[PDB]
Amino acid sequence: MNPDDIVVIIGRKRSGKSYLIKHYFIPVLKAHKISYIIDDHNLLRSGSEYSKFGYNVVTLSDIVSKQYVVVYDREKNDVFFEKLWNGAKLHAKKWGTSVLIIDEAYYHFKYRQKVTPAIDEALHANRHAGIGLILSTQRVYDLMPIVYKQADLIIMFYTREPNELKWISKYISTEAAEKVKTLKQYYFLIYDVNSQMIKIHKPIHHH
């Protein structure tokens, strides 16, 4: 396993998108000893969602010992992303190919007129660094068009919102926009950007 590609996952709260990352993607990576770093922005007072899936890096010991990492980002900032990304490049040097998992990727991948070098690298030179990406967001138009262009794989859950549907058609695939509308709950459509193919996936087993 050498997960250095870019996967974008679109889905609103309650769609089943988070259950797919949290209870499929993350555990498959863990099972294969593939390191990951989670950029988590949703601070609840009982700590956040992914707190269960990795460790907060504080000490010199953590730096060298902790392969599965959770980062709390209250910054939500280009200055923070530069660090997260430099940090990630180094994490891969230590552990081999790692996956940067960014929940609410809006915070760093939204339309900006001037793109920071770390963002440009993440989008264009991720394979050079040995960092796969999983970029998660609620609505397709949350992210800059160039994300969809640079992705290997785009995963979408059901949406009825017409501006969303129109954006999919304009930036990704007209056919994907037609089929997204037909998705039953917890089903997801996968657009493979390399092969240009669409497949509809059944809901993953849940408890």
Ligand SMILES: Nc1ncnc2c1ncn2[C@@H]1O[C@H](COP(=O)(O)OP(=O)(O)NP(=O)(O)O)[C@@H](O)[C@H]1O
């Ligand atoms: N494949 C599935 N089959 C059956 N139930 C599911 C499935 N996926 C998600 N659910 C359930 O639907 C609800 C919403 O799931 P989901 O959208 O993944 O998370 P969410 O709304 O973002 N909440 P959270 O993960 O707690 O932040 C959860 O109660 C899940 O337990």
Ligand SMILES: [Zn+2]
């Ligand atoms: Zn962040």
